[PDB]
User: What shape does this take?
Amino acid sequence: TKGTSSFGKRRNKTHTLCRRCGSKAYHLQKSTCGKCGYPAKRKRKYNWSAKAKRRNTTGTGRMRHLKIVYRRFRHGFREGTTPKPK
Amino acid sequence: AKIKARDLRGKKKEELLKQLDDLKVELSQLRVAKVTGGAASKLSKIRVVRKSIARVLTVINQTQKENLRKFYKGKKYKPLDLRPKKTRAMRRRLNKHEESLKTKKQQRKERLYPLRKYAVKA
Amino acid sequence: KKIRTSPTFRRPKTLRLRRQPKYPRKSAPRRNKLDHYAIIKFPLTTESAMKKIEDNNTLVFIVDVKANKHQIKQAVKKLYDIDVAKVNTLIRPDGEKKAYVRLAPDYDALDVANKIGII
Amino acid sequence: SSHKTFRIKRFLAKKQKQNRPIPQWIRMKTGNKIRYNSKRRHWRRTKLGL
Amino acid sequence: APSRNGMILKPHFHKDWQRRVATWFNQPARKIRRRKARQARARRIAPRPASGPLRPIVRCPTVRYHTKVRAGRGFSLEELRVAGIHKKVARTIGISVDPRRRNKS
Amino acid sequence: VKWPRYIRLQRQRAILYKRLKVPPAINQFTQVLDRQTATQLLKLAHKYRPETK
Amino acid sequence: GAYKYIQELWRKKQSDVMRFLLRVRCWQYRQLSALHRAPRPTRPDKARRLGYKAKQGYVIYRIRVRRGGRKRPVPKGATYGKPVHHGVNQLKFARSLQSVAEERAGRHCGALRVLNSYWVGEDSTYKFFEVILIDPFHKAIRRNPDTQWITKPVHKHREMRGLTSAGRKSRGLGKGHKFHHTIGGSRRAAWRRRNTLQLHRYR
RNA sequence: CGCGACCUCAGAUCAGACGUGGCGACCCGCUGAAUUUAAGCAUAUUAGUCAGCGGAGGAGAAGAAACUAACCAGGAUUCCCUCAGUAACGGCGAGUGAACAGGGAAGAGCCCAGCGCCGAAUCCCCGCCCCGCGGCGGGGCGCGGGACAUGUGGCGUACGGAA
Ligand SMILES: [Mg+2]
Ligand SMILES: [Mg+2]
Ligand SMILES: [Mg+2]
Ligand SMILES: [Mg+2]
Ligand SMILES: [Mg+2]
Ligand SMILES: [Mg+2]
Ligand SMILES: [Mg+2]
Ligand SMILES: [Mg+2]
Ligand SMILES: [Mg+2]
Ligand SMILES: [Mg+2]
Ligand SMILES: [Mg+2]
Ligand SMILES: [Mg+2]
Ligand SMILES: [Zn+2]
Assistant: This one.
């Protein structure tokens, strides 16, 4: 009864998609993620799981804004200027 | 049929808006032709029209922002987008006038006892 | 000599001024990205859509998901110079918004379909 | 479920659009090492555990 | 386990010492960087001595040595007064001055 | 009236100052100059007011 | 001046005048919230000695902190381990209560920066401190060379990192034989120096 | 019976700014064990270590003696060699364990409160004029405001200072 018969009545889900980390870990009743802790301002991470930190770190994503910062620093963060016109 | 920014620089704003409207109408007609079979020649014009629209909008935005920052050139308070955007920390950096600022004690010390040039063994 | 009629002390209503900024937060207002051309993507030319146009005197278009029925009606009116009776919209199981545009009895859906090019 | 929300419907639509096979003309490219999609999802196994 | 007359040894390797091992492969690069910095500093002050300000004569405490003479931190204020050099002027001409040093002898 | 906490505090501190045995160093300032001498003092002080802006 | 007299008066706390004033102030402060802005320094001389200056951009806050030690944050017993670490009640926090008040003042006022704090009163269950804060972006502070050092980013949250006067004492750093620790940057710097195996290339 | 100053305390879609989060190899402040060793084990050891929390920079922290020494004295802080597996600590068991001096790398000193003298001689904000203004400054013209005598600025701080 505790085995195959019990697996039949898994009808209602307890987790949904979190809107901050995107993972299916948002607990419906507690309204807490447990993967990133969305209601908490700070992101959830720990030093006892280094692989988890490596999975979601700065280099993993798009880096849409930081990649431009790298080149802008590499040239000198110049603003409001144009190259010599032809 | 090529649209170049050189000609668009001197054109008036209303002419650029009319050209943008014509390009958008052509793009809509190109989409209609695309979903009705069309042809390779018709389908290859979609990218050309999209890039022409992008060029027209880029010219419009550049001219508008240049005029706007010309207007605010001199005012103490300016819109945030017109302010220089270096970095979060670099905007919190000192004003470059207070760094050169020296107290009267420091100026007295430097004036009274400046660093002098000297040599030995003679 | 103002008597305290009630034993409760509530916060008095003080004067509050309307915001009068010295400078605008941003230089220019954002241009709308949902113009009459962006809302209407392309008409649908399927067999079901063709029968719908021929019989129900309607038009079938693919619309941006963010558009409302009022926006669709106004966009069709401005684009094709037509008057719309009603609009029925749905979200297809692919992410695109599909709208049935019922035409007024004065105009014919077949004629405007021929004019736009779909047949 | 016929009572889905907008986010779930968008997710399902994106998965359905991604389920299509690889076009043939990709194989004719010079530097190509791909033979099949290898990410096809069927609705009997790999039940998309939302 | 001891075995037929070895020394009684107590190695200090009971902590996680492998976590804090400091290698010295940086030594030649460090020496080159120090030499480059020294040469650049010498070039910056073209006529001034590269070593720096003059150092005083100092005798060492701790009767072990009791006889060697080394360079001090700076000349005391009494020495400057006897020699006739202002304490604030002296540091601008290349003379080391410190105000903590006493003068017993 | 259930007054706000600051009004009750500022009244109760005066009540405590009345209740408690105030040492003479603080109690000295309770003895203040009378009105007739105070107005003459102010009349003399108004003549020697310091230069303002 | 009057500041010398004020300091000498404040040194005689056991006197009737000072004890009466302290009792009245303690009652008034106990009737207020645990953290609220004080408009003027209660002790101008102490504030001046600690670095407060009567200029725009200088702010003080009065903070109330519970007295006593720190019991172990555990359930009823549940100090699982050797009986050495069974201590729960009679264990004390390394940092002082004044540093805790400075930390709370800095935490509440993230924009402001804590300069120093001083003692104004204490009860059996409460202690009251006045924490001096400086606005790092006020033109009266930026344009003054003597006070523009605190505007630099290296001085963010001094109380959190134990750089204030109250927080510096808990670090146990100083010159002489009586410490022999923090003889580098801090306790951990000395520990790292003494617990590293310097393996040279030629050994 | 109302008005006028002051002190404490509220309201703002009031004018102009600031903090929030991320990374975290290196750094600073807390909290903080048990595996293990002692051939058992409770003090010890593991170990101010891992785990947990908070806070920055390109370095951080520290730093110019309420010092070291007892010598014919040295002279801020930081790091390297040595001191030294030493003085010392420890069911004096297992084990733990620095500092001074010496040789080097580098080397840079200073500022307040108080004490006192100068008519607040000081500072912030808003208007106009001139320069440059894309790390918003300088000068002048404003009986235009505010902060400040419950103390701003100039001289001046232990090596003495002021007249
Ligand atoms: Mg001064
Ligand atoms: Mg199944
Ligand atoms: Mg040297
Ligand atoms: Mg203490
Ligand atoms: Mg054992
Ligand atoms: Mg064993
Ligand atoms: Mg065992
Ligand atoms: Mg221990
Ligand atoms: Mg420091
Ligand atoms: Mg030393
Ligand atoms: Mg030896
Ligand atoms: Mg003064
Ligand atoms: Zn999440």
Remarks:
- The CA atoms of residues 57 and 97 of chain C lie 20 Å apart.
- Residues 69-80 of chain C form the longest helix (12 residues).
- The helical segments of chain C are 36-39, 47-56, 69-80, 109-116.
- Chains C and E do not touch (no CB pair under 8 Å).
